[model samples]
Structures are given as C-alpha cells and as structure tokens.
Target: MSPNGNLIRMLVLFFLESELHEHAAYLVDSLWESSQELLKDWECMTELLLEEPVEEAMSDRQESALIELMVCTIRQAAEAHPPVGRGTRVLTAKERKTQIDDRNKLTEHFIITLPMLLSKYSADAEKVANLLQIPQYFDLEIYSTGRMEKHLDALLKQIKFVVEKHVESDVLEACSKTYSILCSEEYTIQNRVDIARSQLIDEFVDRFNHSVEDLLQEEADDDDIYNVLSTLKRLTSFHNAHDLTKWDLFGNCYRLLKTGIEHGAMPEQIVVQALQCSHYSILWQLVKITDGSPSKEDLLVLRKTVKSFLAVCQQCLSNVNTPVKEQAFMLLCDLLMIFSHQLMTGGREGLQPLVFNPDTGLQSELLSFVMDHVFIDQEANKIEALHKRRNLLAAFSKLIIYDIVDMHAAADIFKHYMKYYNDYGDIIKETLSKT
Candidate 1:
C-alpha cells in the first residue's frame, strides 16, 4: 500500500483494535521522508483522539488497548537508532559531512516520534510527560551543536503551554512538574539553557500580565499572582531584566514603590514585593559587571536604579514599624553589600563615583539600630535575643565589614561603640571580630 494509505490504514486499524505494527513502521519512515505531512496527520490524529473522547466513541477497553499499542509503537521508534556519541577525535571534511548527514537523519526520526507520543496521550498528561522525559527523545547530547534544536524547540513549545495554561486552570501539580522538566539541567544545557531560560521569562511576563487585572489596582489577594510570578522569575535569567524594563512590565512594581514613597499608602507586603522585583533587577545588572566595570551607559542606569532603591530604603528606615524597618534594613543591607563590594575594589578606571556623599544617615541609622538591639534590647530568655542578634550582626557585618556603606560617616558611630565598650559591647566586638 502507498505510505499515505498505509498511514490511514494504521490509524483506522489501531482504532479498530487490529494489529498495526507493520503499517505503523511504514508510516514512520514515510512521515520522516516528507515531514510536512506529519503536521496534517498530527492535526487529524489529535482531533480523532481528543475532539470528544476517544474511549466514548468506542469501547473503553478497546480504546485503552489501542492507546497502549500506539504508545508501544512510538516508544520504540523514539528509542530506535540509539544515539551514537561523537568521539573525541577530530574528523576530516568528508567525515564531517557523513556525521552531519547522520545527525539530520536521526533528528528527523526523533522529530516525528515526539508528536506521535504526544498526540495519542495529549489528554493523558502523565503518560505524555513521561514520554517526553525519555532522554533519547529530548536530551540528545549534542552540546555546542545546534543539531537538536528542532527537537528541543518542539519540546519547549509544549512546556510553555503547560506552564501558562495549566497553572491558571488549577492543574498546579502537573504544570509544576512540566516546569521542572523545562528547567532541569540534567540531560539539557547551553542552547537548551539559552532557549528555556529566555522562553520562561517571556512566559513569566505573560502570567504577570494575565494573573493581575491591574497591578496597582485596589487590593486583591495577589498571593496567586505572586506565587506563579516568583516561580517563573526563579526560572528566568537575570540578563532578561533589562528587556523587561524596556517592555515597561515592571510598571506594577514601580508604582508600588512610588505609592509608598510619594503617598506613603503602600502596604508593607506590596513594599516588600516591589523591593523583591527591584532587588532581582539590580542584582542581574550588578552581578554581570566585569571586575567593577560596567559600560558607561549601563553604569548610569545602574546608578539611577541604586539611587531610587536607596530612596526606598530611606523611607523604610524612617518608618517606625518593626516589620517596615526590618524589610528596609534587609533590603538596604543586601544592596549595600553588593554596591560596596564593587566600590571597595576601587571600581573601573575613569568611572565617576556612583554615590553622592549625602551622609543619608544610613550608616548611623543601621548602627543605631544594630547597637541598640545588640546591647540594649534585653530579652526574657538566653536564646530569645540570639536570633534577632544574629540577623543584626549579619546585616551589620555585610554593610560594615564589606565597607559597602560610607565608612567616613560611620566613623563617629564606631568611635562611640569603642569608647563605651562594655561586656555587652564585648560580645558584639567578638562577633564583628570573628566576622
């Protein structure tokens, strides 16, 4: 029979509960030859399998048997031509052509196998997921070579769909599982890394926009939005932060920060969420700096962000509420340590100082808080104060020891600590000493 006719026969026979192994093999080879035809076949096949319900159209028992048969056929085809590792020895031009030809052949076969496994089990999320995870299909170890790009791209498309759609539909566990597959370093890296990370950030912005009606709108329980956004953000690359900025998607975060600073009406949770986004943005830019060196334009942007972030810190610090102050101090210390480390290294040549000598009292503020708590904030039990003290010491150490804060401004504060040094002071001194 002709390949097209054989494919139809295989589908009909499989659905009719007849043996289909021979026709299935012929269809696999035929589909690979003119892979464009797979697209049509896949659409038709999926329509039959999922338009209503495969089992309802026929006996449920027969439907189960046929799906198992189809899975078995595709599984073996996917595993056929066990991947051959490219050996370490260099190959000649002629041999390179041979290797390229072999890869093209294998890639097409794997490409065809994916949709077969996926189409039959499209509704069977677990089975389809397991099929994709089979390393032979997805994790073709062609590092540095774009040979597997087609296969990986195909898989990524499916993953993106699950994460974006399933999470909203409340199929949380399965979607989360697919997300793990997307991000997993096992059996995937480099180009796969590049593609997956970039796509994840794109999807995150999608969810960020979809999950919230208006980020700055009146209070809604955004716990759902925050959870998914944060998870997607975790999967995203820091390098994409600038891209997000260009998109103005950080509007929600910026508005939160603005509301807090300008109107002083922002909730503490909003403040922290806004800061979290700001921190990640700044971190990506800062961390990418090469030895205290960032481009002049990049440095300008960085400085502007840092200045605004400092304002956020200033507002947080000035607030009297413990949670507000705590959030601000932690945020400031984290930013301070990063900026200070870069500055202390003397920064890049010919670069102007990023900070103006505005003795914002940040150093004094932090020192006063740390000092008062460490020495004065007596607690009821021995270990009661320990937790708070340790966090205080950690923040102090990160800011002071790193000299990320203004040392000149803090000179007097340290002098006071030294002059009035007591047994309680001795403990702080020891901690600082060890730190």
Candidate 2:
C-alpha cells in the first residue's frame, strides 16, 4: 500500500494536530461511525509499538519518533472514551459496559506495556524516564476501582526498579514526581486505600533506606541529595492515614539529618527539606501518642529520638538561612506545646521519664535558649515575622503556666511580655488566664 509505517505515522500526526481544533470530538465521533476499523487499526499499531522490541538498526531519532507516535495514539484513544461521573446523563447498560470495558482496556494496556517498554529500553535511560510521565495523561481515577487494584503492584514494581537502578538525577526526579502523583492523599485514602499505603509505602521506605545509606557512604551532588530528600518528604504525607512506626521512619530521618550536618556544607534547600521531614515525622509520632500510652520501649526510643532531634533543631536555630531558623523555631515551639499538654494530662512523673535527659536539664536549657536567641527584643514590621513572634509568645506562656520553666526564666518571660504587652495584649491576656 503505502510506505512501511508511514501511513500510520501520518494518521497519528493528523489525530494529534486535529485535537487542537474545536470540533475534534465531533470529528472523532464521525470517524468512529464511518470507519471504526481505522481506529482499531491504530490501536493495533500502538500495541505493536509497545510490545515489539526496538530494532537493532533503528536510529535514536527514529526510536524517539516511534515513542511519540505510540503516546499520541494511546492518549487520543483515552480522550475518545472519558470516564463517567456526576452531571452526565444515565447511559444504557450497553453503553455503560462499553465505557467500563474501554477504560479497563486502556488501564490494562498501560499496566502491562509500561514495564515492558522500561525493560526493553533500559539502556535509553532518558527515554525511559520520559515515558514515566505518560501515566499523567491517562485518567488516574480508573486506578481507584477494585478491578484495577491487582495491577497497581506491577506498576509500583517498575517504578521501584527505576528508583533503585538509576542513579541519574533526572531519572530519580521523574520517579519521585511519579510517586507523588500516584500516592496522593485522595487516591491513597478515599479510593484505593490500603493498596497504596501497604504496598507502595513499604517499597518506598526500602528504597529510601537504601538511597540514604548510599548517600551517606558516598559524596552526592545537591540534585541527588535533593531528589532523595524530596521523596522522604513526600512519604511523610501518608503518616496521618497509616501507621508508619514499623518503618522506623523517624530514626531514618534523624540519621539522614545527622549525616548531612556532620558532612558539613549542605545547601540551604537541602537542609530545609531535611528539617521538614524530621518535623513531620516527629509530629506523626506525637499524634500517635495521643491515642494511647506508648510502650516502655517506645518511650525509650522516643526519648533518644527527641534528644537527637532537639540537638539538630538547636543547630538549625543558629543557621544563617532565615527559613531554616524559622522552621527550627516553629518545630521547637510545637514540641514544647506537646510536652506541656502531656504534662497537664499525664502529670509530671509520667511525662518526665519520656523527656528527661540525664546529661542536660531539658526544660531550663531549652527555655534559656529560646529566650536568648528566639525572643530577641526587636520590632518586626512584616506580618509573617509578627506571626512568628505570636507563636513564640504562646509557647512561652504555656511553659510558664505549666511550671516547666524555672522561676527566674518565667519572671524574665513576664517582663518581656510587659514590654510588648501593648502590641500583643490580647495574646498575653489569653495565655495569662491559664496561670
């Protein structure tokens, strides 16, 4: 007929080009009625593109073009049969079946074909990396269905393969971004639920541990460090929905922070993310404790974890970057509030064992540090800076009312409050009532 594969290429290009025009849907419907077999033929071509191995003699350009053609054809097919939702009229049983069947076909095609392409084109890391983005074009809601649950394991497996195998910054970035999309809160909690949390989280933590170990053992560029930390940061978002204690996530975050600091000269961005990961991990642990009493072993572990965490926070409080300093300040205040709440509810004997450090007087040292550094007597005009001071004063009042701070430090805080009482009279009055 025509040149080999040329007609198919032209058809794909025309489909993509027409998609930009206003009447594209009508044209697709017309084509469906007039020549449905042409659409079938296009589907067959895309299948072949995915299933067949790249030819030995194909130039990189040709291979790239072929990948583009496959993406276009599949994306067009997805657009032709969009998912049904609210506002759409009720469909006949036949129409409903066809709609679901078409959606499943597309999902199954991707679940099977993606890994094959990844393996087939493993040498072309950049191309394989680019292919990771194709899932974003498909309707992600389809993956939430029960029918698609079994297929997610295979999807996560291939992504794990990329994360573990590829050391390239771009590949890692793409993989992490893909993880963020697939493991979003909506998908993980509202729809697919346990599948993503149980399977995906386990795999993600394994890779995170390995990557952190690898980075600790070697010198990595900022991008590599950033990608790995970003993944860890993303992992923390799932803590609220699932129990993450089994993974020792908090310990791992502490280890990474310790290493980043000890190695000296980590970038400000990296430090900020590392701090965030640790902050969220600590918050998750604290929230869990509110549900019930932590076991003795957990208390011991938490003590050690908090000790190390506070050490890191103190260092960050003195950090040159304003963001780092602010983050550390907020983290310190939250820890104080949580500890105060625990003391009020559980009594000093119960809270003391968890927070008490033999080498350092925990409350006095921390209160002094906050007063000397965090509560500098200076006027701040910006709303953000004022908000930060408000948080500081709130935490200071809690420490005072709870009897966590020494008499001398508490008096100092009162005097400091009086000096600025005109500006923060309402906050001071609200907190003073607790006394």
Candidate 3:
C-alpha cells in the first residue's frame, strides 16, 4: 500500500524484466493529457516507471490501490504546479520520431476503433486525431511506408477489445462523455472538412468503400450496432460544425459544400458526409438566389436541386430508428435555422419556387413535409411557430442578440402577417398573410 503501491513496483518490474512492453503498449494510449497539471504529473509517472526495474505486474488485489495511488499522486503534483502559461512545444526531431515509433509499437499489437471510441473516450480520440490534426512534414514523409491504415485498423481492433473486456458503467460513461463534448464549444473536435476537402476525400472514398465491404463480413451484432450508430453521430457532428457561431467565419458554408460534394460517393459514412456538405452549400445558394444576390436563372436551378434533396431526406427518414430519428430532428432544426436565415434576407418577393409553385413565395410542400416529419414528434406532436420563436428568444436573447441572420427572417414573416390588421385599434384582423 505504501511507497507508490506494491502493484506499480511489480508492474515496473515486469516492464524491466519481462515481455510486458507488448501488453503495456495497449494501455499507454489511455495515459493522455488534456490539462497542464495532468500533463506534468503524467510525464513524471512515465519517467518513474521507465526509470525503475519491474519484476512482476500487479495481481488483482494489488492493482486497485496501485492505480489509486498513481492517480492521487499525479493529481497532487499537477495541482501544486504553476497554473498559468502552459503550452506545448514542437517535439524535437528525436522526440517526434520517438513518438511516431512509440505509436507504431503500440498499434503493432492492438486495434483502435473509430468514431465511437474517440467520441466516448477522449484519450482514444486524441490518439486517432494526433497525427492527422497538425499536418506536419514528418507525417507525410513517413506515409511512403504505408503504416497509416495499418495502424488505424489495429486501433479499431483495440477499441473492440475495450467493448468486450470492459464493464457496462465504464463503457456508458465513455459514450455519455463523448455525447456531451459534441455539443460543447470548447471540447468538440474540429470538423476540419475544408482541410479534408483539399486532400483526403478522394482517397478516403476509395478506402471507405473497402471498409463497407469489410463491414459486411463482420459477425458481431454489438460491434455493428455501435458502428452504425456512431457513424451517424459523427455525420451529425460534421453537420453541426456549421452552426457554431463565430462572426467572421461565414465562408465555412462554401467549404462545407465543396467537401460534402466530394465525399458523397462512398457508402455509409461518406454518403451522409457528402449530403450534409452539399445541403449546406445548396442552402447557402438558396439564400443567395432569393436575395437577388444570385441571378434569377441561378435561383431556378437551385429550386430544382431542392426538390431532389427533399426526396432523399424522405427516404432516409423512413428507415431511421427512433434514436437516429431524434438526432435527425436536431439536424432539421439546424436546417430550419439556415432556411429562416435565407428567407429573411431573400425578401418575401424573391422566394417564388419557379419549378413547383411559381406564384407562391414559400414552397408549401417542402414546408409541410418538414413540419410533419421534423417539427412534430410522438410525445410532442407539433411546435407552433410563435411558441418556437418564444423559446428561441428565451435561449438566444441572453447573448446581446446580434446578427439579423436569424431575426430578420422572423421579423419579415411577422411583418407579412401584420398586413391583415390595419392600424388604429382593430383588435384582430380576418386575413393572414406571409410574403
């Protein structure tokens, strides 16, 4: 129990004396840092372990206290260290190569899984994202040896191992944490769709199609379920990144479109990715068309495109299960936000659906379909627009309420309806109108 726990000493012994590195490597990815305190303490522990000789790894009873002591000690060290000005430096040439070799060694035996693992566990997410995030020269230089996919495949396998060997509470915690991070402004992974658009989509399509073939051969139902669900989760994430509000980043919409279109051809993951990207692009185009920003001829082409996409959404929604359907509702909300933004800018006159309903400014069929499928639900059948706006006001007005991007649409629609009531104290009017 004392002196950093007997079990750790034994693990150190095993590290020094036996073939434990093979097993130990699988556990190393779990030792990741997201805070300065955690980082310094963890680095210290790694130094201690690597310094000492290990005779045997811990037995069941000893492992508990061993982990407890390690955690507490590391936390204490992290707490005592200076809190400000923590930043990471570029790894020295030797350090970078060591990191690469260490990662390759870790994956040499274990598989790391995709979206679910990363989403559920930050460490695994960091591992999978580490090399891909920064786009350094060494990474590209090493790609000639073909280690990338091999390591990724191995990591996926290790993730499957976690699902099987771990208990329910821990696994559920992983998923819960991942879900929380998805909606968060700080912890969320960058969609980075633009960067991928520049390089990865074409190659990713070829690889992803092969992944589908491999997916077909898998026998485990649990694995398949997680894969399917997580694939959609990641897609939804990629979709929502556009909704993150930063005043200067409006051009992200075009990146979403360019990348989304490029990735559309692959099965499962890539297909949805493409559709989402393209949808955002087209959504942007619609706003442009209605505003006279895009020419009348261009608006005509977009209206036709909208009809085609509406059909696709209908088909996808029919077969989607309850949970996924719920996620789709949220996705729809985002789309509505975009649509409303466009309508406000496009003016009531500009929105005539030239192909479907040339005289009506609003596309009735599209609105009706979205109202039924997206706004209504089993417990809550429908959300009245007034109520929705009220709720939106309650949530949004706290932020000092900038950007006519959302509000101008509501005000324009409100002004259209106001025409029914003449000024000078008529309590209510007979006619209702939308421009």
Candidate 4:
C-alpha cells in the first residue's frame, strides 16, 4: 500500500489493538503531524531511538554515536514544530529556517543540525548520522576554511558555540549537513581528529554554553523551571567540560525524560519545544541571582509551567491516531517516564495551587495500552528498569548515608519510586517470561 494509507492503517490499529512497536520496521516512519486540537482526539506516537542498555558490543565510540542518533531523532522531530515567541503565535517560517536569512546553509556548517542532530548521534555513532550529511560534503571545500588548522580551530569554536545554543529539536536539519562533512565515509587524518574533537565540542557547548550572559535573559526566575532548564544547560557544560568527546551525544535518553515533564502548558509539540526553550531563557539565572533563592512568585510560576506538561501530554494523546493506534502507546510510555522523573524532583510540590490531573478516560485508555505492551525491547526495558532502580537506590542510599532511615521525603520518593519500580518490574518480568 501507499505510505500514507499504511500510516492511516497503523494509526487506526494503534488505539484499537496491542501491536505497535513490533511493527516499527514499517510504521515507525509512518506517523504524521496534526494540530493541537486534533491531538485531543487520538493517540500520538514517537519511537524512541535512544533506549540503551549501558553494556554490550558497541565500542565506547560506536555506542555514543547510536545514542546521539537517538537524541538527534527526537530533536529533529521536536524541532519540526515551529517556534512560538513573545507576542507571536509562531516564528515566521523564514525566521525559524535562518538566523540571518538565506545565508549559506553550511555557513553554520557546525549548526547544519543545530536543532536536533546532536541529540541523535555523537561523533561516536558516526557512521549512521554521518550518512545524513553526505549531501553537504559537496558544500565543503578549502574555501570554507583555509589552512586546515585555521579551519579546524574555527570549526572547533563553531562546534563549541553551536552546542551552547541547543534548543533541542529538529537535529536533522541543523546537523545533517555538518555531520556529513565531518563523518565523510572516506576519511583523512584531519577529518578523524576533527570528528573526535567535534564530539567534545558538542559535549561542551550543549552542556555549558551558558555563563553570565544567560542570566540577563530570563523571564521566569523560579526554581523548578530553573532546575530543569539548568539541568540541560549544565549538561552542555558538563558533557563538554572535558577536552575530549566534545560532540558526544550522551545526553539523549535523558531528554525523553526531560521534555516529557508536564508543565501547566500542556504537551503540544509547541509545549515540548517550550519546555526546551524555557532552559535558555533561564541559564542566566546562575549569574543573575546573587541573592539566596528564587523568589516565591517566580517559583510558583515555574511550578505551574512544569505542571502544564502533564496537561499537554493528556491533551495531546487523548485519542489514538486512527492509522497508528498502538504508536500512541509507545509515546505514552515515554511521556510518563519523562514527567514522572520531573514530578519527583520538587516540581510537583511547587505546582500552581490548582487542580491539574490531566489524565482522563482517554488517557486511561492510552495507559492501558501502554501497560499492555510496554516492552517491545526486552534489553531496553531491562536497562530502563536499571536506571529506575539506580535512581531509587541513590535515594535509598542517601537515606542511609544521612542516617535518616526514617526520612520523610524518602517515603514520598519511594512512593513514586515504587510505582515506577513496580511498573518497570512488572514489565521486565513479563518480558522475561515471554521469552
């Protein structure tokens, strides 16, 4: 059948049946885009490309590359949504496409995948992501750089700055061109070193690009928004703090958890994009705040912002895509996993003093679908469980470390912990038995 027809069929079955992820070979690329109001009716989907086991055959290098691809995929898709700005419903398509207008697409060669590519692959998962960039190779020449060293140094700086500005969406368009240039199938010594060092640039820029400048630009200086946004800003900082692995995409899987958080805004792709942009707006906070804590009013606003994400999730996935019913199930797993992490981290307590249980009959149905088919990836499910146990263990271990076995928050931590603990556990066990 035609691709569009197949997409419709897959979407329909997604809500009505249980087989979604298993059919990823065909349906994975079949899901389509819809507006916010349309999302209220059916389930939506995104096949997470970055679920990892933290073990096995991939070289440390290749492993990183695959993870980068995953991150890039989300960023790419996430970027596909237009940017919304102050007093504007959307950034003109022209603005979203270019910063300075019709400039060489490759001038920001470092940013060829600006919005998303870095999320999907680091120089480590080089080959696949490298392929995405083949078309851009023709765009590269001695003219783009000069004495290879001069170009290399400039590119390294470019790589650094590019990563520093991550809004985390649509990596394909941003990085694809550059990735191709750097990861050329046939390599030269400079290319090899450039690719490795670029990975480091990605690590550095994506994590810590914000310094004193970020503080001047924040609108909501609250704690929860501050925490999540900085978590990402710091990632760009920490990941690239090293002189090596600058372009590493180690930050991928964390995002599925990150953007999935329920800020009061709702889970519109725009909302997810907001969750991302909210970070850059606040990075300056560290430098901006000389006082003790974020003000209460700001904190409450942030709390509300975070809560909106859950509402968005519920609103977006209220119904299944008629062609890809089960696809929404996978998206639901990721959304829950993302926001649940946010919920535990003080985001919930600070939530606006309002009723915000976004879940409803449709959500329940989606969750039912999620519960029924949560593990199309046995090894990945095992890894996800390990991540959960590991986080809880840190909490449980902290209780022992602080010698507060009777810890109050730990109980609450365990409360939510047990819920995911059980969810992860049940899925793991059932998956094992199925084998």
lDDT of 1 by residue, 221-293 (tens): 5675465345434323232323235334444556556766776655565566556666666666556554454
Q: List the residue pairs that clash in candidate 1.
A: 340-404
- Candidate 3 accuracy as lDDT: 0.37
Better of 1 and 4 by lDDT: 1
User: What tens-digit string does per-residue lDDT give for candidate 4 at 1-435?
Assistant: 234323433344452346554432122223323322222111111111233434332344433333333233232233433223211236576646542322233323333332233344434224333423423423244323433445444444544444444434233224424534445533443465456555654543444334212422344345434434443443433321222232322233223323343333312332233333333222232122223345667655544544543443344443333212232333333334433323334444432332233244643454333333332234678777656535434433433334223334335444653676676988888889976
Superposition error at 414 for model 3 (Å)? 23
TM-score ranking of the models? 2, 1, 3, 4
lDDT (10s digit) by residue, model 2, range 42-67: 34554545544454334465565556
Evaluated against the true structure, the overall lDDT of model 1 is 0.52
Residue 231 CA displacement from its true place in model 3, Å = 8.1
Question: Which lDDT tens digits does candidate 3 get at residues 75-104?
Answer: 223233222333224456865654555444
Q: What is the lDDT for 79 in model 4?
A: 41
Candidate 2 yields a Cα-based lDDT of 0.61
Overall lDDT per candidate, in order of appearance: 0.52, 0.61, 0.37, 0.37
lDDT for 10 (candidate 3):
54
Two-way TM-score contest, 2 vs 4, winner: 2
**What's the CA error at residue 305 for candidate 3, in Å?**
3.1
